[PDB]
Amino acid sequence: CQDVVQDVPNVDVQMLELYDRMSFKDIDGGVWKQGWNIKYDPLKYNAHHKLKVFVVPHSHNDPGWIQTFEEYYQHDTKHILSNALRHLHDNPEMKFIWAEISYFARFYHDLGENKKLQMKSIVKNGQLEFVTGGWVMPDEANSHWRNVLLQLTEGQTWLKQFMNVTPTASWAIDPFGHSPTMPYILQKSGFKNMLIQRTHYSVKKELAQQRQLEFLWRQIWDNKGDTALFTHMMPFYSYDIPHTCGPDPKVCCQFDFKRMGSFGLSCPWKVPPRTISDQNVAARSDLLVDQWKKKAELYRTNVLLIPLGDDFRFKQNTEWDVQRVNYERLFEHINSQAHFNVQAQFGTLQEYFDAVHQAERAGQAEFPTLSGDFFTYADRSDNYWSGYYTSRPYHKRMDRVLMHYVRAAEMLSAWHSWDGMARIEERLEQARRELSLFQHHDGITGTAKTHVVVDYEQRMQEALKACQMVMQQSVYRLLTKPSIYSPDFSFSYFTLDDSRWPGSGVEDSRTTIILGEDILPSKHVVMHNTLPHWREQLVDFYVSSPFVSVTDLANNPVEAQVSPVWSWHHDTLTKTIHPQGSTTKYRIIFKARVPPMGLATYVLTISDSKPEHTSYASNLLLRKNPTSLPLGQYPEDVKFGDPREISLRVGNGPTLAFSEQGLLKSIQLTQDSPHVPVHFKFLKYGVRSHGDRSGAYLFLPNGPASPVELGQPVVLVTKGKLESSVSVGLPSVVHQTIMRGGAPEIRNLVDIGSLDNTEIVMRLETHIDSGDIFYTDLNGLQFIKRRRLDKLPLQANYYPIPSGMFIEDANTRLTLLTGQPLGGSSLASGELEIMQDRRLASDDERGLGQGVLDNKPVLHIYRLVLEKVNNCVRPSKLHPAGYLTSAAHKASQSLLDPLDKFIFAENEWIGAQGQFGGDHPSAREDLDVSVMRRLTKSSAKTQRVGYVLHRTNLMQCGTPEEHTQKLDVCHLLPNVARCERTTLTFLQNLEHLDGMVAPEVCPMETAAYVSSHS
Ligand SMILES: *[C@H]1O[C@H](CO)[C@@H](O)[C@H](O)[C@H]1NC(C)=O
């Protein structure tokens, strides 16, 4: 195993280093506005060394953006695919690449058999080529790597099955900035090449000047280079035709033959395309070839990529003809005119890369190595696309919830083979596809029109319901005596209970477990732990009486705490934000202990009075002018007081001090250690009154954020033996700090309401001497070092915070983990900040045609980890990565993959069992079974189950290792006949494993295994 901490990779281009050096001046470079006038030596190409040009037709089809997926499919995409089928069938030399399999699968399934055969034929013969082959072309900033893999697999499994092809070249022309997470997954999924387009214009300029637009992109910690994936970065401002034939859009526009009038399109540079004829073909070729040779100067081989396409192009048959015929006249003239020394033709993406590598292999070029990412993207001037790291945060949070439900559903149902009648496969496929669809770069990015966002939400909601059905049928089967198990596949044996989604104050969706001597004395509940190690976590349930005790299935008492159910109300009469306690339902909380990838059953029983093992939290409402807060049968009276500073400590955990406004001000790790200054503060960014406006994409603040005026907020303090909390009703945010004995959990119920042109940010102020350094993660896969650059505007120093961020000095680190992707930064030494929501009245000119005025209440969750790191073995100062500690990593897992909770829905569960998986291996803490998915239906003689195993890398800080067993996923199910290591999509077998044993992987590595069972 490579050491991912101590050896700094030596690469030709390291993006953080490059950023530190570049000036980013936005100078008018002439026709190539963000470059310079490219010059070339006409003698470079000659009879013995021609410029081979591949014109690659394409059509960017967004699976929802300004229309929904189905509206685009009906209005555009099915026509584009129907016409591509016909035109390619009829013109053997024409080529076309297709990226979005969600649309392709939708189309293909609707085709009659004759057409399906024709389609398979033009794919088999090389005319229609799939690039990437994912369900979508995902966002690369907010997406979790697990979902990026899911959607890649969903599209590629479909392609393998129906088209019998697996793309090895990736095409990503529209995500707003690019992540090294893509080559990481692609290279482990059989890919050999990839292409990206939206990178900062200064980066394009800089790499173009060094002919570093093509590089072997390896991971920032990869010293050896085995993660390397050849990457082609396009040079220009857009993937449209004006910006893909060469440096001068005014000339390239003349070669987009769809811009002539009848199609309603034209060239904004005022020179229109002209039909090619024998009389103008030489002059038109003179121009075009000159653009091609200029573009070629930016690369190292004699093979040139010329994308030919734009959004939803190649729709009309007349469009296919006008593009094809004119280009064919150009090629016939150009290839027969020796003085150009060019051979041009239509080609596919793979053809381009194959030829590039043939040149490489002929020793014609050597490519630079590169590590780093391509955030935050700016397409021009100071228009940095960091706004979408936060836009529509409700759905960004919903993405992580569904991410986990899909994993839990596939995992829980994987243990058994299911009769087709149970419709397990059907529900899982729907869930995977709706979550996969949302990975689209107008999905989770929050950059779609309002009615499209609604479509994605509805799709995700049905996916959540599908996961729940599968999960609950699976639990019932796993914990019921086999000879008693009598499933009704449409029956709800259990109701899932989720305490954080939609979340208290977002939706009253949790069921109350109703107990009573005259109706039901007790209720079984079950917890599932998708993580491959024994895990304890507090869980809570609403119950109709505060007098409830908990026992496990051996009937041992489990210590529990009951607290009131508090809801905050923006009281439009008193004009205050204050809490009301339920007088009919209460929260019972207890520590569940659950086996690795397993289940544990508990029982909640009512009694007429306080049970022996249940304690009650005290509650204190701090505000001037209080009124009574009755809590029905709750046994402890609420106390009142004027606002004041308070301190709390749960268990042996840290002691936290809060200001009289209910906000954290310090953390004391142990009883005599210092009260470390850690202050939460909420601020607001506005929008510029002149100049460019922030929108769904762009963050264009009118200066540093200003503090939210808090007034004298109502602060509620609940103190219990297992869980205490401090909640405060601030304008737009009910901010809650929850303590359970370790790092606190922070929850913000964010309702930006009607505050127009406002972005609410949550900032942490500490005295950590972090200087200009901070770390943020990329797709929940790795942490990359960021350096705040004052030579760039504030919005450029904002980065995606998909799952966590931290600052540290030599001795102390503060890590903020998130249950949802949001944008954030460290704008000053000792600070961390992360945007909560943003509401913008204006469109920001990237085509969306609206601002963001559809905000809705969202419950953001976090874990805040203050730690000493002076004893941790950290990377050197020059290393571009950072790594979590055991505690921060576990804190991230508690947000992304909490225990799942199930309430038995009927009065009595006959044949109930207490636990499942007590014999599953409890693997080392840095290892995760990211995916467990049965790959065969029940009628398959040889059953196959796929596993994706990921090991992160945690810092060694002096804590002795301890126990753990080796996890061999191939022996998790019985009767194993074969164990194979495979690509991450499970589509290709890479290694037959001796003894049918699946080895664990190395730190930061990810492997996929498939076990076959007789
Ligand atoms: C397709 O898969 C591979 C690639 O061509 C080939 O060897 C095999 O014969 C094909 N199978 C078909 C046509 O289904």
Ligand SMILES: [Zn+2]
């Ligand atoms: Zn797009």
